[PDB]
């Protein structure tokens, strides 16, 4: 991974993402959302991540 002052940034487009396999695969200390609920990400449909 990159350094905090030199943080890597990439773009996600044109895919069928699945956020349930990021949510339920529990290996994470903090997992919090802002303005979105974590369970409704299965239904949402975005322009860019």
């Amino acid at each position: 991974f990159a350094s905090v002052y030199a943080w890597n940034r990439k773009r996600i487009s044109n895919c069928v993402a699945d956020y349930s396999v990021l949510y339920n695969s529990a290996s994470f200390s903090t997992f919090k959302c802002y303005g979105v609920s974590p369970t409704k990400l299965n239904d949402l449909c975005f322009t860019n991540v």
Binding site: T39, K40, L44
Partner: protein, 49 residues
């Protein structure tokens, strides 16, 4: 048959009544502080708390 604004007293009560109903619909697109001005979109992406 020729001179317009011969009935300018009756046109005002139509213009006043329509400008008020016009401003009532246009206040449905304000946020008033929230993240969205549309009620379906905060029910499609947030938890009931």
């Amino acid at each position: 048959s020729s001179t317009a604004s011969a009935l300018g007293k009756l046109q005002d009560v139509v213009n006043q009544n329509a400008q008020a109903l016009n401003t009532l619909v246009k206040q449905l697109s304000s946020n008033f502080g929230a993240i969205s001005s549309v009620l379906n979109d905060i029910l499609s992406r947030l938890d009931p708390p």
